Design a protein around this ligand. Sequence first.
Ligand SMILES: [Ca+2]
Length: 258
Amino acid sequence: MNWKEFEVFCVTYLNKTYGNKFAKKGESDSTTSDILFTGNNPFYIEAKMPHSQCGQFVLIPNRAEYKFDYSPKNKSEINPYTQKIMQFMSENFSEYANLSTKGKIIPLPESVFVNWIKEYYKSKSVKFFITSNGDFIIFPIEHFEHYFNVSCTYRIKKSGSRHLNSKSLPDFKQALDKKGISYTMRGLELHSDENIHDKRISGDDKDFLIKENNGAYHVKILSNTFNANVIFSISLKNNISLFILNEDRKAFEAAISL
DNA sequence: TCCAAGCGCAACG
DNA sequence: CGTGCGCTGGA
Ligand SMILES: [Ca+2]
């Protein structure tokens, strides 16, 4: 299954097992806002597939000072583990200043990355994680390292897309015309008997992406921003202590009962 | 309303 | 197993 199906899988399990107290609906925040436990002791439940990513922050190379600057537009504050990562990269500036999409791994102790993850998810009121190895596994953030292996890389991650809008619509119709695509527009929705799912076309400094949705195509404008972020990858352990697992399930059952 | 950017997510070649 | 689109301040 994909990660969206996985998250629904997790929510359904929580509600059927522990009562209909776990919400996954409405808008999300610019930070992690996954599953919400809606009881008297509320907290957010972060769902992770066995191979996932797990937080990030953008660093800007300062080639005059040979150090990395924390982006003022980042959405989490510098903690000591942020600082240890930045310090390591800055002391090794020439090794990290040539940005790449393949990334460069950061060889600090794994506990630095685990502690960053703990600090970040705690700050977003994420108190528990849920994952699955065939059985559901629920555990508190303070015990993260008993469940996931963690690594850390610095890589270019292109920013995301945005919806086609009215201002861009003439440009997009002209891009379809130039590419020879047969089409009709219903507002901002695209209709075509051609097979153009995942088609990429460009026009007037905009890269467009076409995606099939129900009975029409939805059109996106891709980003032109290619900044680099420290970003954490996690892999579910194959050797999880059943003792820690059991006490952590009780910790969850306590949290939802307070 | 619109755009650049950062964070969401494992996805995918 | 070694890359980026969908969504969400400030002008
Ligand atoms: Ca990594």
